[PDB]
């Protein structure tokens, strides 16, 4: 059984537990690998990516919906989905630590519906997750 919602809302345990947070996921073992080599690798384009929302007007809302619409832009792949998943955990890292834990439920709560109504297509067709752990699996 694979559900976006169940590893949308523990996914976000690594991002915020390092800071100060609870939750987990069980096949986070995957995404995280994924990720934590990501956010090393590319750490200045991710961070010259953030500080561009964070300059823009938008608010918490606003800044997903434009960090989303130019990572999914000229397509899909498990490569943005790795990095989807890296910004969506920053964006929460951030309110919690400007006075802003309840947004983390918000930021979650959005990350769920898109998964589940944009990227529930592809991923279906890549294999779905079963494709995604053969490929980067433990
Ligand atoms: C600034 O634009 C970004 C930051 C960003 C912008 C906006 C919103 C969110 C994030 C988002 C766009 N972006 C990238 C950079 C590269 C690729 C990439 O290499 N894709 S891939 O398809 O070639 C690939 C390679 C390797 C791995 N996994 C390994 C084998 C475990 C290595 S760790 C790794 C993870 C992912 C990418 C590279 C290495 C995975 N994966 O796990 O999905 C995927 C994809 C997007 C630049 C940073």
Same mark, same amino acid.
């Given at each position: 059984?694979?559900?976006? %919602? &169940?590893?949308?809302?523990?996914?976000?345990?690594?991002?915020?537990?390092?800071?100060?947070? &609870? +939750?987990? &996921?069980? =096949?986070?073992? #995957?995404?995280?690998?994924?990720?934590?080599? /990501?956010?090393?690798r590319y750490r200045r384009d991710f961070a010259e990516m953030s500080s561009?929302? *964070?300059?823009?007007? /938008? #608010?918490? %809302?606003?800044? /997903?919906?434009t960090v989303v619409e130019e990572l999914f832009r000229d397509g899909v792949?498990?490569? %943005?989905?790795?990095a989807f998943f890296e910004f969506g955990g920053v964006m929460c890292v951030?309110? =919690?630590?400007?006075?802003?834990?309840?947004?983390?439920?918000?930021? !979650?709560? +959005?990350? #769920? @519906?898109?998964?589940? %109504? *944009?990227?529930?297509? +592809?991923?279906?067709?890549?294999?779905? +997750?079963? !494709? /995604? =752990? @053969?490929?980067?699996?433990?």
């Open positions: 059984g694979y559900d976006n %919602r &169940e590893i949308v809302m523990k996914y976000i345990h690594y991002k915020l537990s390092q800071r100060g947070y &609870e +939750w987990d &996921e069980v =096949v986070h073992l #995957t995404l995280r690998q994924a990720g934590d080599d /990501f956010s090393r561009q929302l *964070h300059l823009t007007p /938008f #608010t918490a %809302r606003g800044r /997903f919906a792949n498990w490569g %943005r989905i790795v951030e309110s =919690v630590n400007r006075e802003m834990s309840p947004l983390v439920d918000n930021i !979650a709560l +959005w990350m #769920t @519906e898109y998964l589940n %109504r *944009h990227l529930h297509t +592809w991923i279906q067709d890549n294999g779905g +997750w079963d !494709a /995604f =752990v @053969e490929l980067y699996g433990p």
